[PDB]
Design a binder for these strands. Structure first.
Length: 49
DNA sequence: TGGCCTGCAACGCGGGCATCCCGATGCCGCCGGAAGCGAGAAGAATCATAAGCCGTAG
């Protein structure tokens, strides 16, 4: 939902992950930073999904 | 297509009968072995008590 509200489509340029992590911690998931980053890494691994 | 079962006819040998000689055997007495499973001991299958990682959380 945060990535959709931010407006980062597939046909756009890349963006830094720290901004997205900070936004998620600030608005919706204020439960640390390690879990969100680990979830992002897990979603980014091709051999994991 | 080749071989087998059976009817007809001819031949032979053994079933039955008795008994004399005979071989097992039931019984009796004396001696042997194995069973008797109960118990002691060893081996093995199974049960009971720690970790390692799977991913977000502190």
């Amino acid at each position: 939902y945060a990535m959709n509200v931010l407006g980062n489509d597939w046909n756009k340029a890349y963006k830094k992950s720290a901004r997205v992590v900070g936004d998620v911690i600030g608005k919706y998931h204020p439960h640390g930073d390690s879990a969100v980053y680990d979830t992002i890494v897990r979603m980014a691994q091709p051999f994991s999904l």
